[PDB]
Amino acid sequence: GAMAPSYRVKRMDIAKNDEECVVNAANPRGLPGDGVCKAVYKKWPESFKNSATPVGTAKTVMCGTYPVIHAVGPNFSNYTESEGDRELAAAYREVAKEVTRLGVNSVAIPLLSTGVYSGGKDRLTQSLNHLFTAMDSTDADVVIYCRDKEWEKKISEAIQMRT
Ligand SMILES: [Cl-]
Ligand SMILES: [Cl-]
Ligand SMILES: [Cl-]
Known part of the structure; x- marks a missing residue:
């Protein structure tokens, strides 16, 4: 675990x-x-x-000894809002199980279903809240990766609001 x-x-x-x-x-x-x-x-x-x-x-599939956890979020073009929300929450719960099983002290994670799988919606809050629900009970350092400057601000604010 992280200290x-x-x-x-x-x-x-x-x-x-x-x-x-x-x-x-x-x-x-x-x-x-x-x-x-x-x-x-x-x-x-x-x-x-x-x-x-x-x-x-x-x-999870190993590249050498480096673990790559393949997490499959729903494509909201194909799923209903209700079913998509359930599958997106489930993908993050399975990530938490893998991170725990591997015994790592840190994990890099993207926001699932926020890009091409978003069905053209802003799902920052929905995806981030499912990430927190899953990862809050783990003791790994979590580092969320994004590409947009305003998303960085919003994610940083959401993290700091809980501290
Ligand atoms: Cl995506
Ligand atoms: Cl982004
Ligand atoms: Cl870069």
């Missing part, structure tokens, strides 16, 4: 993280994909051996 488990946010490519493991915003078929998934494929391609897993689940 004083924390949440932080950084605005940069998750493929350059300084944590003991990474969460990929995966597709269910283990394909290279686009966005976070493509950056993860270029950095850790060995981790996409048998990485396919259903929506709402997480599957």
Whole structure:
């Protein structure tokens, strides 16, 4: 565990993280994909051996000894708001189980279903709150990765409001 488990946010490519493991915003078929998934494929391609897993689940594959946790958020183009919300909460619960099983002291995590899978909605708060629900009972240092300057501000404010 971390000595004083924390949440932080950084605005940069998750493929350059300084944590003991990474969460990929995966597709269910283990394909290279686009966005976070493509950056993860270029950095850790060995981790996409048998990485396919259903929506709402997480599957870990090692790249050397570095764990890549493939977490499959729902595509809100295809799911109802209700079913999508349930699957997005479930993907994060499975990430917390994997982070715990691996025994890491830190994890780099993107906001699931906030990009191409958002169904053209702003899901910062919805996705971040499901991340907190899952990860609050873990003792890993969590570092959230984003790319947008105003998202960095909003994520940082949400973290600091609980401290
Ligand atoms: Cl960067
Ligand atoms: Cl996404
Ligand atoms: Cl972002």
